Amino acid sequence: GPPGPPGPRGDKGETGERGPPGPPGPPG
Amino acid sequence: PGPPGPPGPRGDKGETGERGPPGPPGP
Amino acid sequence: GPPGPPGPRGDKGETGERGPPGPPGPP
Numbered sequence: 001g002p003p004g005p006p007g008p009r010g011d012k013g014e015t016g017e018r019g020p021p022g023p024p025g026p027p028g
Numbered sequence: 029p030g031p032p033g034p035p036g037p038r039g040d041k042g043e044t045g046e047r048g049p050p051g052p053p054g055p
Numbered sequence: 056g057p058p059g060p061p062g063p064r065g066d067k068g069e070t071g072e073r074g075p076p077g078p079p080g081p082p
Contacts, residue, residue: 004030004059011035013068016042022077023047028054033059042068049073054080 001056002029003057004032006059007033007035007062009035009062010037010039010065012066013039014041015069016071017044018071019045019074020047021074022049022051024054024077025051025080026053027081028079030056030058033061036062037064039065040067043070045071045073047073048075048077051077051079054082
């Protein structure tokens with residue numbers, strides 16, 4: 001018979017890593 | 029008609045977030 | 056008929072959140 005239709009799109013990827021910590025503030 | 033295909037592969041991991049801002053001024 | 060092909064790869068993940076604020080500056 002004719003081929004089946006395509007499967008559904010895959011799941012969305014995992015969330016990216018949180019950014020790294022900011023540098024120290026200005027001297028006081 | 030054949031059966032529907034299986035689900036596609038999972039997407040790529042997202043981009044890393046930006047570095048945080050500078051801390052507050054010192055004392 | 057033959058099974059359908061696998062579906063397409065999923066979308067890219069969300070970008071990570073901004074990092075935390077830095078520590079206080081020097082005195």
